[PDB]
C-alpha cells in the first residue's frame, strides 16, 4: 500500500525539482524548514526523528536540498518528510508537511479488534513492518 500521510501523497512521488519549488515557496514566506525520518508509519507516530536542527536562518533553497540529500544518504530505509514551520503569532505550528522518500514496499497495517462492552470494539492499528523488526531494520 501507499502511506498517504503528507499533503501531496495522492500525487506521484515528487522529483527533486518539484521538492525545491515547494521549499522555495515556503522560504519565500519566511518559514523554517526541517527534515525528519521514521520507519514507524503508524498514523499516531507524532514524533519522527529530527535530522539536525530546523534550518531557521537558511536563505538558499539549495542548502535545504543539500541536507535532504544528506539525510537520504545516511538514514535507514523508511520515510522522510519535509516540514515548514511558521513561528508567527496566531500559528506557531507546522504549515506544510509532505513525504520526500518512502520505501519501495510498504505492507501497511491491519486492524486488531478487542471485544469491548456491549457491541463496542476496542481497536488497535498495527504496522506489519514495525511488529516484525526493530527500528533501523524494518524495510
Amino acid at each position: 500500500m501507499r502511506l498517504t500521510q503528507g499533503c501531496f501523497s495522492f500525487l506521484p512521488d515528487l522529483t527533486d525539482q518539484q521538492i525545491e519549488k515547494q521549499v522555495a515557496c515556503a522560504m519565500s514566506r519566511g518559514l523554517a524548514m526541517n527534515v525528519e525520518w521514521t520507519d514507524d508509519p503508524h498514523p499516531r507516530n507524532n514524533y519522527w526523528e529530527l535530522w539536525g536542527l530546523p534550518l531557521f536562518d537558511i536563505k538558499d533553497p539549495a542548502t535545504v536540498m543539500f541536507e535532504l540529500n544528506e539525510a537520504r544518504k545516511s538514514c535507514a530505509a523508511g520515510y522522510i518528510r519535509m516540514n515548514a514551520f511558521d513561528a508567527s503569532y496566531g500559528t506557531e505550528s507546522c504549515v506544510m508537511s509532505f513525504i520526500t522518500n518512502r520505501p519501495a514496499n510498504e505492507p501497511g497495517f491491519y486492524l486488531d479488534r478487542t471485544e469491548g462492552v456491549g457491541r463496542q470494539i476496542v481497536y488497535s492499528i498495527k504496522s506489519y513492518s514495525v511488529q516484525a523488526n526493530p527500528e533501523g531494520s524494518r524495510y
Binding site: 500500500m1 502511506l3 498517504t4 500521510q5 503528507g6 499533503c7 501531496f8 501523497s9 495522492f10 500525487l11 506521484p12 518539484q18 519549488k21 515547494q22 515557496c25 508509519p41 503508524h42 498514523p43 499516531r44 507524532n46 516540514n83 515548514a84 503569532y89 496566531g90 500559528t91 506557531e92 505550528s93 507546522c94 504549515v95 506544510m96 508537511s97 509532505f98 501497511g108 497495517f109 491491519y110 486492524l111 457491541r119 463496542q120 470494539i121 481497536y123 492499528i125
Partner: protein, 481 residues
C-alpha cells in the same frame, strides 16, 4: 398628599413620554471606550421618524430605557448604563436607510454569556413599530469581554496537529441521501469515502435519531468504517457524528458515547441554540473532541440586506462560544455567497485581529484577544472542477466538503473521493510553484493535467463541467474597491 408633594418635577424625570434622543441615548460627542461593546445597525425608519430618534430608540430599548420616564433610574448610576448612539450615517445609494453606531458599557453584560449579550442586542428592538426594518451588521467585542469566553475548544492549529495534516485544505463530504439510510449503510458510505481519500465525512444536519436509523447504530458502524479506513491508509480519519438532540441530557449522552468509542469529532446544529452550544463547547475542550457547527436555520435571519443579523456577527458569536468549525460559504456553490461578504466571514473566523475593511463588511477594528481560530467549512453544491476558485477565494485553512460531488460519482464513492483529493493536491502544488491558477485558462488545465493520469478525476471533470450556480445575491456590500 405625600405622593403629590414628592412627585418628581425635573425635565428628565417628571412622569410622561419624551423622545429617546432626549433621554440620554443620543450623544454625537461620545468618546468610545476600549471596553465598550459596539454595534452597527442598518436602520430603516418608518416614514416621518427622525433617523437620530430611531437610533436612540434602538440604543435605549437595548440598554436601560422604556417608552415612558421612570423614577427608578435615579436609584442607579443611570448615565453609566445608558447605551449611546453616537454616529448616524446615510447608507450609500439610499435616501431612507442609515448606518447607526451604538456603544454599550462593558458592565451591561454577563461574563461569558452569549445568551445575555444577545438578550440585549437583539432581544426586542427588531420588533419596534417605529422602525420598518433593522439589521445588525457588525459588532466590536472588546478584548476585556472576549477574555471571559473560551473561544474554540480546539482551534485550527491544534486541529491540524491532531490530524497530522498540514499544507492543503481539509476535505470532507456529507453522506447522501440526506435521510433514509440505515446505520450499517451509513458506515459503508463513511468507509468508502474515507478509504477513497477524504479526511472526514459527516452526518447530514437532519440525521439525528430516527425510525430508519437510531443513533447508536450509526455511531458504532461509523467507527468501524473510520478505523478500517485509517488502517487502510495510515492516516487519522474521522466522521462528524451528529449529537444534535431534543434535550441537553440527550446531547451529552451522544457526546459521551462518541468520546467513549474514540471519535475524533462530533457535530452540532445551530438550531440547538446558544446555551446548548456554549455547554458543548466547554465539554469539547474538556473531552478532547473537535466540535463542528452546522449553521442550520441561519439563513432565516441572515439572507436579506434590509433586516436580520448579518452572518459575520454570527461568526463572531460562534467563535466566542467556541466551536472548532463553522460552515461559512463557498461563493460558487448552491448556497448564497457574494465573494466580498464571504471573504469577510473567513477573515473574522481565522485572523488574530481585524482592520476596518468596508468592502468586506468589516466595519470595526477588533482584536481577537488570542481566542483560538475557527475553521471555516465550505459546503454545498461544489465539485472538483471548481478547485481553482475554491483555493483562490477560501485559502488554506478550510474544510472543503463535497457530498453530492463525491457520492454522485458514477464509478463509486471511493472514485469520487479520489478525484476530489487529486484535484485538491494538484491545485495546491501548482499554486505553490507560482502558477496563475485562478486564471480561467491555467486553473482548469492544472486539473486536466492531473486527470491525464487519474481516471476518476477525468470522469468527474467531464460529468460536472457545465454546472454553475449564477444568481443575483441578496447579501451584498455597500462599499467598493
Amino acid at each position: 398628599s405625600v405622593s403629590e408633594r414628592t412627585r418628581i418635577k425635573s425635565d428628565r424625570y417628571e412622569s410622561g413620554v419624551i423622545p429617546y434622543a432626549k433621554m440620554g441615548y443620543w450623544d454625537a460627542a461620545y468618546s468610545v471606550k476600549d471596553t465598550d461593546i459596539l454595534a452597527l445597525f442598518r436602520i430603516t425608519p418608518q416614514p416621518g421618524v427622525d433617523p437620530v430618534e430611531a437610533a436612540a430608540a434602538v440604543a435605549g430599548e437595548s440598554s436601560t430605557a422604556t417608552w415612558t420616564v421612570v423614577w427608578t433610574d435615579l436609584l442607579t448610576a443611570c448615565e453609566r448604563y445608558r447605551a449611546k448612539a453616537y454616529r448616524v450615517d446615510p447608507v450609500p445609494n439610499s435616501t431612507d436607510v442609515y448606518f447607526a453606531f451604538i456603544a454599550y458599557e462593558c458592565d451591561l453584560f454577563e461574563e461569558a454569556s452569549l445568551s445575555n449579550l444577545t438578550a440585549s442586542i437583539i432581544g426586542n428592538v427588531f420588533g419596534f413599530k417605529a422602525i420598518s426594518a433593522l439589521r445588525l451588521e457588525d459588532m466590536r467585542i472588546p478584548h476585556s469581554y472576549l477574555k471571559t469566553f473560551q473561544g474554540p475548544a480546539t482551534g485550527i492549529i491544534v486541529e491540524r496537529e491532531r490530524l497530522n495534516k498540514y499544507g492543503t485544505p481539509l476535505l470532507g463530504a456529507t453522506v447522501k441521501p440526506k435521510l433514509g439510510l440505515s446505520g450499517k449503510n451509513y458506515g459503508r458510505v463513511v468507509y468508502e469515502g474515507l478509504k477513497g481519500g477524504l479526511d472526514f465525512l459527516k452526518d447530514d444536519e437532519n440525521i439525528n435519531s430516527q425510525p430508519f436509523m437510531r443513533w447508536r447504530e450509526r455511531f458504532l458502524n461509523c467507527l468501524e468504517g473510520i478505523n478500517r479506513a485509517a488502517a487502510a491508509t495510515g492516516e487519522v480519519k474521522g466522521s462528524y457524528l451528529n449529537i444534535t438532540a431534543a434535550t441537553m441530557e440527550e446531547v451529552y449522552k451522544r457526546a459521551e458515547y462518541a468520546k467513549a468509542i474514540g471519535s475524533v469529532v462530533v457535530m452540532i446544529d445551530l438550531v440547538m441554540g446558544y446555551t446548548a452550544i456554549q455547554s458543548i463547547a466547554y465539554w469539547a475542550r474538556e473531552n478532547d473532541m473537535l466540535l463542528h457547527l452546522h449553521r442550520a436555520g441561519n439563513s432565516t435571519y441572515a439572507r436579506q440586506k434590509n433586516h436580520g443579523i448579518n452572518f459575520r456577527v454570527i461568526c463572531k458569536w460562534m467563535r466566542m462560544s467556541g466551536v472548532d468549525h463553522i460552515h461559512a460559504g463557498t461563493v460558487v456553490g448552491k448556497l448564497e455567497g457574494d465573494p466580498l461578504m464571504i471573504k469577510g466571514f473567513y477573515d473574522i473566523l481565522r485572523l488574530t485581529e481585524l482592520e476596518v475593511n468596508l468592502p468586506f463588511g468589516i466595519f470595526f477594528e477588533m482584536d481577537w484577544a488570542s481566542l483560538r481560530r475557527c475553521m471555516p467549512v465550505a459546503s454545498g453544491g461544489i465539485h472538483c472542477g471548481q478547485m481553482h476558485q475554491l483555493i483562490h477565494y477560501l485559502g488554506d485553512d478550510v474544510v472543503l466538503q463535497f457530498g453530492g460531488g463525491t457520492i454522485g460519482h458514477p464509478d463509486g464513492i471511493q472514485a469520487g473521493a479520489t478525484a476530489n483529493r487529486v484535484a485538491l493536491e494538484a491545485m495546491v502544488l501548482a499554486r505553490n510553484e507560482g502558477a496563475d491558477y485562478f486564471n480561467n485558462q491555467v486553473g482548469p488545465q492544472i486539473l486536466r493535467d492531473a486527470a491525464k493520469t487519474c481516471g476518476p478525476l477525468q470522469t468527474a471533470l467531464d460529468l460536472w463541467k457545465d454546472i454553475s450556480f449564477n444568481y443575483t445575491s441578496t447579501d451584498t456590500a455597500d462599499f467598493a474597491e
